[PDB]
Amino acid sequence: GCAYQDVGVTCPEQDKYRTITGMCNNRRSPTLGASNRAFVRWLPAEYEDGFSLPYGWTPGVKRNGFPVALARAVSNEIVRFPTDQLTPDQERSLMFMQWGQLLDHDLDFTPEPAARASFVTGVNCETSCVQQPPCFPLKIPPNDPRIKNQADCIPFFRSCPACPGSNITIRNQINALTSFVDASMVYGSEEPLARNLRNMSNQLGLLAVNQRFQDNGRALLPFDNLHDDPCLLTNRSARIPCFLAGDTRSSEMPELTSMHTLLLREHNRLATELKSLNPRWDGERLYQEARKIVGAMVQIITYRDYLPLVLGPTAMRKYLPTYRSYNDSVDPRIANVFTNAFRYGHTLIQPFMFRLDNRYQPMEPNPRVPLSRVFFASWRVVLEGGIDPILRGLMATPAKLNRQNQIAVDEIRERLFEQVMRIGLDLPALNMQRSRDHGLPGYNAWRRFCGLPQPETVGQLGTVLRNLKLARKLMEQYGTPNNIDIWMGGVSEPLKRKGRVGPLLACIIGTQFRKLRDGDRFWWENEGVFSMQQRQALAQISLPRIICDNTGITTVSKNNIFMSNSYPRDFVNCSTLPALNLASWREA
Ligand SMILES: *[C@@H]1O[C@H](CO)[C@@H](O[C@@H]2O[C@H](CO)[C@@H](O[C@@H]3O[C@H](CO[C@H]4O[C@H](CO)[C@@H](O)[C@H](O)[C@@H]4O)[C@@H](O)[C@H](O[C@H]4O[C@H](CO)[C@@H](O)[C@H](O)[C@@H]4O)[C@@H]3O)[C@H](O)[C@H]2NC(C)=O)[C@H](O)[C@H]1NC(C)=O
Ligand code: HEM
Ligand SMILES: *[C@@H]1O[C@H](CO)[C@@H](O[C@@H]2O[C@H](CO)[C@@H](O)[C@H](O)[C@H]2NC(C)=O)[C@H](O)[C@H]1NC(C)=O
Ligand SMILES: *[C@@H]1O[C@H](CO)[C@@H](O[C@@H]2O[C@H](CO)[C@@H](O)[C@H](O)[C@H]2NC(C)=O)[C@H](O)[C@H]1NC(C)=O
Ligand SMILES: *[C@@H]1O[C@H](CO)[C@@H](O)[C@H](O)[C@H]1NC(C)=O
Ligand SMILES: *[C@@H]1O[C@H](CO)[C@@H](O)[C@H](O)[C@H]1NC(C)=O
Ligand SMILES: [Ca+2]
Ligand SMILES: [Cl-]
Ligand SMILES: [Cl-]
Ligand SMILES: [Cl-]
Ligand SMILES: [Cl-]
Ligand SMILES: [Cl-]
């Protein structure tokens, strides 16, 4: 992750497809957006020592004039709420949550050292509570609702430093993925992985499929071969390993696995149709042309259907005006802050995985499973009915609504990864510790970056949040709004009209997606990428149709899948939805 690496790469004078790593998207600066490089910083890093130590590291060292709040204390006092009072979102489906996670996994993955590598550096962060690099465990406050022993801790490994061993540079972190919206969560962001994901036994251009199991005759993802596979720890008698995909997190919840599996099937379906249309195309051509369509589908669903429902209309117009042209001066890298701000989606998570049968009725015997029993539970996809019941549950049940007194559920705040760790983790608290690990500036620095007022007093914060009660709780924890961690402040803001983030997150997220679009030479609407006939055909795609084409589901949401969420009111027969017409891909 040193910036000088690959500075001298020359891009081919002409090319036809994206590289796997993202290299050579920008011909003038070929490393922009390429994988395994440092995040860009939109603001200078803020560390306790100005260089690398995170705020909270050294006892007694203040931040901006006030003591650092324990991340777990903030979670306990601000985020915790009684699950029985959860508010369903009347205007978003659970698919709105799940697309956000899948999309995140096209954009950024921040590596950290493995427990396996603790041999190199003393402390195993998974089992020890000692604060020694690379560990930065979360301390336990007094009166914790779950962890009564204050000598315990929540495990935490610091993110890998970019360019370790440099003594002059402020610590930064690495994005292992291509920043572009290019379906790298399907295809991989590194060349060896990308080849291993492909079926190289024939000339059909397919992605490899599971060789042990099928889902009512349809493909599943291949199994991965991991050291310390967490999926094996969920159902220990079944011993079903994690799945292999373009991104390493595909097994983290079966709803996410289902989306990965859907896109795998869609690739193979497209490659099959393109072979029929163009019998002389070899496997490499079929793979690249199918991959190019899948990437465009991800871009279309994301920008046409998803982002307007995140940002709301006024923030769309401000941060994502109509596309005009590719500009090679636009920096398409993921910003460090985005890795934390886009975790707003944790506020959308429901405490169960839901499964519905082919009458859209709760699927017996167990129509809902607590989320803390589905993490890494790849066995549930293989042995409990495949992806159809999960996809129905995503379409037909609501997202959780973010409310200022109902921020995130205890299935992730108290029981994250409980089956596979020595202790349940607290995802909101991890988000806050991670922002400190990454040296991110606090709430007001980001407000300033976004051109928004910076409240200083409890009364000013109450005005910004339109909630004096919440402002008082934040001030009691943090002392000053300058110290509120970006995720916590971002998700505390009242939501934009017809959106699901407030002004600060709308700015950060909208800015990021504008750069990913305007700085992408392979953006699907850029002149020359597709023909005009192909662009017209692609405008007909939708996530409901992809579901129709690749599953046993024959009744699906009406368009906006992310808004539709109530059956049968919002549903139609697949027979009424035109399939993507590939006629304009025919080459004589
Ligand atoms: C690379 O791409 C090729 C071509 O697509 C793949 O080949 C197919 O792989 C699938 C998945 O394993 C094969 O499916 C299975 O067929 C078994 C019988 O095979 C015979 O019959 C077919 C014709 O129908 C022939 O093509 C084949 O050569 C065999 O003669 C069935 O017994 C299987 O069903 C059982 O297993 C599944 C789990 O796998 C259970 O769910 C079922 O309940 C049942 O117990 C299964 O249907 C398919 O036959 C292959 N086709 C061809 C043409 O080769 C490669 O798999 C792929 N490689 C990779 C790594 O992805
Ligand atoms: C089943 C749903 C989800 C999870 C399980 C889950 C879990 C995590 C974890 C454990 C992390 C890392 C925590 C840490 O810092 O140690 C994490 C990071 C990120 N998320 Fe989470 N997430 C689930 C769901 C979502 C949704 C719906 C998201 C967005 C709409 C979302 C985003 C993100 C992002 C961007 C990150 C950082 C990724 C990176 O490494 O760069 N997640 N999530
Ligand atoms: C682990 O997975 C196994 C295998 O699917 C589960 O066992 C099945 O459970 C159902 C319901 O009780 C039975 O009808 C099957 O006959 C069982 N199969 C086998 C091979 O035992 C088991 O319940 C799962 N365990 C946990 C803890 O989730
Ligand atoms: C690509 O984007 C850059 C950045 O906006 C454009 O350069 C700006 O152009 C305007 C209008 O001519 C000038 O007023 C600015 O001073 C320029 N800024 C910089 C940093 O050069 C550039 O014109 C765009 N390219 C195309 C083809 O539209
Ligand atoms: C960084 O500092 C360490 C310890 O002082 C030293 O061993 C190493 O040579 C330094 N690195 C560079 C590039 O000077
Ligand atoms: C969907 O439409 C097809 C074609 O008209 C029809 O055969 C099928 O029965 C319909 N399915 C449902 C569930 O309405
Ligand atoms: Ca990508
Ligand atoms: Cl940043
Ligand atoms: Cl470290
Ligand atoms: Cl396999
Ligand atoms: Cl409140
Ligand atoms: Cl159905």
Residue numbers in the entry: 157 to 744
From the study:
We present the high-resolution crystal structure of proMPO recombinantly produced by CHO cells and demonstrate how the flexible propeptide blocks dimerization by the formation of a disulfide bridge between Cys-158 from the propeptide and Cys-319. Monoclinic proMPO crystals (space group C2) were grown with one proMPO molecule per asymmetric unit. Because an SDS-PAGE of the crystals demonstrated the presence of the full-length protein, this clearly suggests that the propeptide exhibits a high flexibility compared with the core of the protein (Thr-166–Ala-744). The segment of the propeptide visible in the electron density of proMPO is anchored to the core protein via a cystine bridge (Cys-158–Cys-319) together with polar and hydrophobic interactions, resulting in a buried surface area of 399 Å2. The same disulfide bridges are found in mature MPO, with Cys-167–Cys-180 located in the L-chain and the remaining disulfide bridges belong to the H-chain of leukocyte MPO. However, most interestingly, Cys-319 of proMPO, which is known to form an interchain disulfide bridge between the H-chains of the symmetry-related halves (74 kDa) in dimeric MPO (compare with Fig. 1A), formed a disulfide bridge with Cys-158 of the propeptide. The crystal structure of proMPO shows that the stretch 273ASFVTG278 was part of a surface-exposed α-helix loop segment with all six amino acids surface exposed (accessible surface areas follow the hierarchy Phe-275 > Gly-278 > Val-276 > Ala-273 > Ser-274 > Thr-277). The structure of proMPO that we reported here fully supports these findings, because it demonstrates that its core structure, including the substrate access channel and heme cavity architecture, was almost identical to that of the protomer of mature MPO.
Neutrophils figure prominently in human host defense against infection, and optimal antimicrobial action in neutrophils relies on the action of hypochlorous acid (HOCl), the product of the myeloperoxidase (MPO)4-H2O2-chloride system. In MPO, the prosthetic group is covalently linked to the protein via autocatalytic formation of two ester bonds with highly conserved aspartate and glutamate residues and a sulfonium ion linkage between the 2-vinyl group and a conserved methionine. Among members of the peroxidase-cyclooxygenase superfamily, mature MPO alone is a functional dimer, composed of two identical glycosylated protomers that contain covalently bound heme, an N-terminal 14.5-kDa light polypeptide (L-chain), and a 59-kDa heavy polypeptide (H-chain), with the two H-chains linked covalently by a single Cys-319–Cys-319 bridge. ProMPO contains a 116-amino acid N-terminal pro-region that is required for its stability, as its deletion results in retention of proMPO in the ER and failure to undergo proteolytic processing to generate mature MPO, but its precise function and fate during MPO biosynthesis are unknown.
